[PDB]
Design a protein around this ligand. Structure first.
Ligand SMILES: Cc1cc(=O)[nH]c2cc(-c3ccc(N)cc3Cl)ccc12
Ligand SMILES: [Zn+2]
Length: 209
């Protein structure tokens, strides 16, 4: 059901998506352990993901959340990295994409910092790094992240010192770092229908000069 349309680097759409990737890189407290060492990406391809059935599943849930709020979907564009990105684009998000061990509960996690999502491309904590070289800081192998449309509705704010249900009357959780003043938020949803994988971004991290 899914089809991928390649965006031209000359298209303003490709260029705004690239800008959101590049401008939300930050340094990580693990010194690059999980995601590698870099300040910016080499973007190789940006594809728009088109699936009628998944889109209708998304907009159907969105209208429901919308109505339970002050007519407010609270829709964001957020990053998601995972070994399962090729499966998500075909069958959608579900409970098997849930982070059982997550600090904000057993749901699906999205990030404002693209570099936070980059830490999960090869698994929790970066797994063992790329398949070919077993290198979490690999500058050669091609990586992929999703840039997703996410319905937050009434989000429960949880300050952080850095499939389950949302707290009563809430549609998601906001995990907001309170120690690192440069770290942006993560968000957790507990229903797969609350996210749509809009763009598939293929890239390399760049070795600093
Ligand atoms: C915080 C966060 C951001 C993100 O962009 N992606 C994630 C993915 C996982 C996750 C969950 C289950 C499994 N099996 C694998 C993986 Cl990589 C967790 C956490 C995140
Ligand atoms: Zn590699």
């Amino acid at each position: 059901g899914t089809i991928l349309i390649d965006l031209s680097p000359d298209d303003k759409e490709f260029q705004s998506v690239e800008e959101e990737m590049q401008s939300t890189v930050r340094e990580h407290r693990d010194g690059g352990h999980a995601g590698g060492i870099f300040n910016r990406y080499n973007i190789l391809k940006i594809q728009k993901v088109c699936n009628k059935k998944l889109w209708e599943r998304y907009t159907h849930r969105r209208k429901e959340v919308s109505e339970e709020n002050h007519n407010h979907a609270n829709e964001r564009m957020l990053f998601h990295g995972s070994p399962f990105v090729n499966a998500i684009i075909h069958k959608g998000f579900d409970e098997r994409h849930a982070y059982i061990g997550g600090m904000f509960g057993a749901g699906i996690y999205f990030a404002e910092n693209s570099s936070k999502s980059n830490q999960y491309v090869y698994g929790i904590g970066g797994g063992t790094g790329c398949p070919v070289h077993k290198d979490r800081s690999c500058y050669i192998c091609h990586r992929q992240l999703l840039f997703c449309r996410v319905t937050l509705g009434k989000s429960f704010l949880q300050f952080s010192a850095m499939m389950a249900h949302s707290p009563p009357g809430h549609h998601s959780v906001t995990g907001r770092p309170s120690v690192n003043g440069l770290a942006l938020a993560e968000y957790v949803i507990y229903r797969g229908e609350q996210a749509y994988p809009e763009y598939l971004i293929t890239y390399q991290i760049m070795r600093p000069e």
